[PDB]
Design a protein around this nucleic acid. Structure first.
Length: 1136
DNA sequence: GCTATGAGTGGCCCCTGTGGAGAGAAG
DNA sequence: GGGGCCACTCATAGC
RNA sequence: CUUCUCUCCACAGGUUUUAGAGCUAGAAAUAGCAAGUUAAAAUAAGGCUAGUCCGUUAUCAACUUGAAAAAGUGGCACCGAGUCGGUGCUU
């Protein structure tokens, strides 16, 4: 007989609970065949379980690593281009200079040339290091000196600037010369007073330098400066100028009574064009005011970056660096003097001991500046004469280095200015510097646009660039080779959705005219109007809709019901009183794009001509796709003969954002085979039918619907791995859903391939995705009317109902005891779901007894999914060289004993190998049987040829047939039922689960929440009395933990510590005792051992660091549900 | 008895921070 | 949070 | 309206080895003194499809077919419950 059965599921991020129950809520038990070479031929197991797995990972880390790799490759290529430029002239001076630079990492033994890189002789190297203590001294020397310098110093300065070219967050031109705040503020005030003599501003006595350069937010500084100026407001014209000078985006619409918004921001790429537009409307007499404001903004921005302006030089950054160096020297001398004068004993600690956070640890050690200040501040406070030192410490300027974390705010314009100064001064002697100055400035300033992406020849899955030619892309011919416009189009396109109705079609922009007309006609479709003498409301005719649109929508931005009534029904149709239903106050759809185009083009006939629909759609698409105005102008140039220069310039100014939901081929692309009208045409006029879009698509008579179902095809692949990958959510939930699908498939396979009556799920849109997938796979048969026969009911509940069911009938849940709660929740969800569904398409004693029996079952199939670990080869921290064989070489020729390297590799999976190993100085062969961990790095070589890989490690005569793949969490069974999971090649994990009786679980749950019960006072008192009467369960729980520990955990030290700790705290309050005992299950939990705290005692974790014991145990392969399993006894393998 | 070796135990180790642009769904 | 690594102590086989 | 997910563009550090002649007294251990701020190269081993590209996401119990994708392989009922046991039928 086909037994009716239901499946309950519980899907989480780390688990998939599953339970199969029959109509009477009893979980069936079946006898399963066991394969392998053991004596256990058949095993009885209840059909209930839980699948556990590691949480899924987001692709953020891989993306960050890939972006970093591209950055590093491109920086290397910049240095290579500079060396290629300098190659011809360097060969005449020193041919081996570049080779010496490259080999600076190798030790003296491994170098092919002389060890000193710059000059190749110690005398000149020492002379250079004495003359220029830091690279900034060399940079300033080249900036200020007019003498012919060595080409090597020029190369060093240029390479240092190119390699560390600073940020690009401030596009435009930045002038370090106007770096004084007060003078430019005074000039701006004077210009404003000259332009506004009737309202002069008194700026006398106001310290602009302090207020504008203070370490406060932009708005606070703006409010502070305005507060010092009588009669001025932060919303005034001068207030807006100051806000612009502080890096805000002030609005000048109110200051000049403009019709449209006038917002200016210097950091934007379009400050110049917006400022020009503002001047074109308010006059060019205000240009000097904006120039002065821009100069003041530059001064404010560069005040922090560069600090010295008194001297006449073109390298302010180098001057500031040298000032930091000199201040550090002076402070170090003073500090040494004071320490040696007052605290001689601490001199060794501060200036010699690298392990501490003193100066020695600050320079040669790894101590940070913050740590150094923390260490030195109490010492300085204990000595006299440290007032200046304390003040500098409070400002984060004492003994400061030159390469700190604050250098992230240096714009690339400073570096470009220094580069240009050096090139200009040194080009008088070197013609190749004169000829190639533009190339060098390009190399420093060239940056791949964000919308072009990686420059690949198709062999990359991340690349969307289109190439005009096949030449190699270089920064000098980037514009000629890479089609920027097509690349921007593809960049925007690939991220937008396909149409829901047609998966092939691309969606239209939101502000397209066709979409707006479609929405307007759809809204007017359902509008009803009632006039005097009319018995029933009537729909608007096509002529009426056309007249209404032409008279109101094309003339008013927003159309209301009152406007319609007063303007069309009363004026045109002569209806004095009309009642309108379907629209409450105003129409949702509006022709904003049409109004904008009428304002710009100023030609209504051009907009209203049907032949111009394609041109207008293309123009709107161009406006929405592109952000750079040059691309917009280039593409709109095709229409230059249709619009004048002013119109073309104005069109270059409007930008649209957002995309629609329906494609053009849907609304106005497909045509009816019988009538030839498109959906838009039907909305314009459909006779008495007046069908809206929903009515048109659902209407069977119209060809559009069946042409739509014919347009969709069954997705190749798709269902299976691909379809779940296309859902909306974190990849963790995708992994969970795929595991749930496989669990259900295997359960169907188990029950004789008879599909279940019901499938109950709880975890809502992701719930909808799971339900759709399950229903799609289960139901595949259609009736004679092509209606899908729902043989399986996919029913979705919410966890609140099951939680209330648990709380009402005392089926309590404690997560820390074991992993059975997943299976129990699946079973209870199945019970409640089936009861509710059969009740709305339950004997008390018998059903409740069945539930008690099920929840007290000891045998639940908990399965840990075996996973081949992948990821990074090892830890990324590079360690100092040591005499150890466990270091990993960062390059093929870099011996870790000399250069250091990586450490702690991660093992992908282990292999059991039976072979012979030479041991001892006698090199005698001995048979071995052990686990060798194949690292992630060596995985490819091992899978390529395991025999050679094993021979290279010293194994001889390898038995190929016995090589067993053992991924992580492989399960081994040992004597007395003790089980261990393979954590790695040399560590194990606990594999057994504690099965407490439900009475102890109930007692623990009631005791832990003794003062947190949520219920009636009588029920709370009854539960409290139940807890108090059953205090002896605590001893029983401890005894059972001890028994299970002695049986499978083998933690004698930890167990004795726990037992002693319990004995000392045996008088603690019952709630505290239970709360602390719940921690003790951390000893017996499945998985990796972990530390835990029991009252005031901390128990360290017990790690199983030996895998020799499992080499003679039983290997268990478990299927995804744990029902089908193959047992292999390893002790019988490798026998002599 | 000495030497080199494996096995158990306790403790320490882990790359980080920021800006800009675009697109999508889900509540 | 969890596996890798090292320093220290103690049987342990072999000489 | 935001959060989250995906993709591209850049920056600043960090670590590693090497260069920046250490001096004096002593046979040496060692003790005293002087100096400290910077720079070059690498930043997953490398791969071929030779690009200013790609290399940490996702997927993966065992056996048979295959290069892989992928397909196939395991009796039922009843009585009980400490990780599942027993009995009958089929066999």
């Amino acid at each position: 007989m086909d037994k009716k059965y239901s499946i309950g599921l519980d899907i989480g991020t780390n688990s998939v609970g599953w339970a199969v129950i029959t109509d009477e809520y009893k979980v069936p038990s079946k006898k399963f065949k066991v394969l392998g070479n053991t004596d256990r031929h058949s095993i009885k197991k209840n059909l209930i379980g839980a699948l556990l797995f590691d949480s899924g990972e987001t692709a953020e880390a891989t993306r960050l690593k890939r972006t970093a790799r591209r950055r590093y490759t491109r920086r290397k290529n910049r240095i290579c281009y500079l060396q290629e430029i300098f190659s011809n002239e360097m060969a005449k001076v020193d041919d081996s200079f570049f080779h010496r630079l490259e080999e600076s990492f190798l030790v003296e033994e491994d170098k092919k040339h002389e060890r000193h890189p710059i000059f190749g002789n110690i005398v000149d190297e020492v002379a250079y290091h004495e003359k220029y203590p830091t690279i900034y001294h060399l940079r300033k020397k080249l900036v200020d000196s007019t003498d012919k310098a060595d080409l090597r110093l020029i190369y060093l300065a240029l390479a240092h600037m190119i390699k560390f070219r600073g940020h690009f967050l401030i596009e435009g031109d930045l002038n370090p010369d106007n770096s004084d705040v007060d003078k430019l503020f005074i000039q701006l005030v004077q210009t404003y007073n000259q332009l506004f003599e009737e309202n002069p501003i008194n700026a006398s006595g106001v310290d602009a330098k302090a207020i504008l350069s203070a370490r406060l937010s932009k708005s606070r500084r703006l409010e502070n400066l305005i507060a010092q100026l009588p009669g001025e407001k932060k919303n005034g014209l001068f207030g807006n100028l100051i806000a612009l000078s502080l890096g805000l985006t002030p609005n000048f619409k109110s200051n000049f009574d403009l019709a449209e918004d006038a917002k200016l921001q210097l950091s934007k790429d379009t400050y110049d064009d917006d400022l020009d537009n503002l001047l074109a409307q308010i006059g060019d007499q205000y240009a000097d005011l904006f120039l002065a404001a821009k100069n003041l903004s530059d001064a404010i921005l560069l005040s922090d970056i560069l600090r010295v302006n008194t001297e006449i030089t073109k390298a302010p950054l180098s001057a500031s660096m040298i000032k930091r160096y000199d201040e550090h020297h002076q402070d170090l001398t003073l500090l040494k003097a004071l320490v040696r004068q007052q605290l001689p004993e601490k001199y060794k600690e501060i200036f010699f001991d690298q392990s501490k956070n003193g100066y020695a640890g600050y320079i040669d050690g790894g101590a940070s500046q913050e740590e150094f200040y923390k260490f030195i501040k109490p010492i300085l406070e204990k000595m006299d004469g440290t007032e200046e030192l304390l003040v500098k410490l409070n400002r984060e300027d004492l003994l400061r280095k030159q390469r700190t974390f604050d250098n992230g705010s240096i714009p690339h314009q400073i570096h470009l200015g220094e580069l240009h100064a050096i090139l200009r001064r040194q080009e008088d002697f070197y013609p190749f510097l004169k000829d190639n100055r533009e190339k060098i400035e390009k190399i420093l300033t060239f940056r791949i646009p964000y919308y072009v992406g990686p420059l690949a020849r198709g062999n990359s899955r991340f690349a969307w660039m289109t190439r005009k030619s096949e030449e190699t892309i270089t920064p000098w011919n980037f514009e000629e080779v890479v089609d920027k416009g097509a690349s921007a189009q593809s960049f925007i396109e690939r991220m937008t959705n396909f149409d829901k109705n047609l998966p092939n079609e691309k969606v239209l922009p939101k502000h397209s005219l066709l979409y707006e007309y479609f929405t307007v006609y759809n809204e007017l479709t359902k509008v009803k109007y009632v006039t005097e003498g009319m018995r029933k409301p009537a729909f608007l005719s096509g002529e009426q809709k056309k007249a209404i649109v032409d008279l109101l929508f094309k003339t008013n931005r927003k159309v209301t019901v009152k406007q319609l009534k007063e303007d069309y029904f009363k004026k045109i149709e002569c209806f004095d009183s009309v009642e309108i239903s379907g629209v409450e106050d105003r129409f949702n759809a509006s022709l904003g794009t049409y109004h904008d185009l009428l304002k710009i083009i100023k030609d209504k006939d051009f907009l209203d001509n049907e032949e111009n629909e394609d041109i207008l759609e293309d123009i709107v698409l161009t406006l929405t796709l592109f952000e750079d105005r040059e691309m917009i102008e280039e593409r709109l140039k095709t229409y230059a003969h249709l619009f004048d220069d002013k119109v073309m310039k104005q069109l270059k100014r409007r930008r649209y954002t957002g995309w629609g939901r329906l494609s053009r081929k849907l609304i106005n692309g497909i045509r009816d085979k019988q009538s030839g009208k498109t959906i838009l045409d039907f909305l314009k006029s459909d006779g008495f039918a007046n069908r809206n879009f929903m009515q048109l698509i659902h209407d069977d008579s119209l060809t559009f619907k069946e042409d739509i179902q014919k347009a969709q095809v069954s997705g190749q692949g798709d269902s299976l791995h691909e379809h779940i990958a296309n859902l909306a959510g974190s990849p963790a939930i995708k992994k969970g859903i795929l595991q749930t699908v496989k669990v259900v498939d295997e359960l169907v396979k188990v029950m004789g391939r008879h599909k279940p009556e019901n499938i109950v799920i709880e975890m809502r849109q992701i719930t909808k995705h799971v339900a759709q997938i399950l229903d799609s796979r289960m139901n595949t048969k259609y009736d004679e009317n092509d209606k899908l026969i729902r043989e399986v009911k996919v029913i979705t509940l919410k966890s609140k109902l099951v939680s209330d069911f648990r709380k009402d009938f005392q089926f309590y849940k404690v997560r820390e005891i074991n992993n059975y709660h997943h299976a129990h929740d699946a079973y209870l969800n199945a019970v409640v779901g089936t009861a509710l569904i059969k009740k709305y398409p339950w004997d008390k004693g018998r059903d409740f007894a069945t539930v008690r029996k099920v929840l007290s079952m000891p045998q639940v199939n908990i399965v840990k999914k075996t996973e081949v670990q992948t990821g990074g080869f090892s830890k990324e921290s590079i360690l100092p060289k040591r005499n150890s064989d466990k270091l990993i070489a960062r390059k093929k020729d870099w011996d870790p004993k000399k250069y250091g390297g990586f450490d702690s590799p991660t093992v992908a999976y282990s292999v059991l190998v039976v072979a012979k190993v030479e041991k001892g100085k006698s090199k005698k062969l001995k048979s071995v049987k052990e686990l060798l961990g194949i690292t992630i790095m060596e995985r490819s070589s091992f899978e390529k040829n395991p025999i050679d890989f094993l021979e290279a490690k010293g194994y001889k005569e390898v038995k190929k047939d016995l090589i067993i793949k053992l991924p992580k969490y492989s399960l081994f069974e040992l004597e007395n039922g003790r089980k261990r999971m393979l954590a790695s090649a040399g560590e194990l994990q606990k594999g057994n689960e504690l099965a407490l009786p439900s009475k102890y679980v109930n007692f623990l749950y009631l005791a832990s929440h003794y003062e947190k019960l949520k219920g009636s006072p009588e029920d709370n008192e009854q539960k409290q009395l139940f807890v108090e009467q059953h205090k002896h369960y605590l001893d029983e729980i401890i005894e059972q933990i001890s028994e299970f520990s002695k049986r499978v955990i083998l933690a004698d030290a930890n167990l004795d510590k726990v037992l002693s700790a319990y004995n000392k705290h045996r008088d603690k309050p019952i709630r505290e005792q239970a709360e602390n005992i719940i921690h003790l299950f951390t000893l017996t939990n499945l998985g990796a051992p972990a530390a835990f705290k029991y009252f005031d005692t901390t128990i360290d974790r017990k790690r199983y660091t030996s895998t020799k014991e499992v080499l003679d145990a039983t290997l268990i392969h478990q299927s995804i549900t744990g029902l089908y399993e193959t047992r292999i006894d390893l002790s019988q393998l490798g026998g002599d």
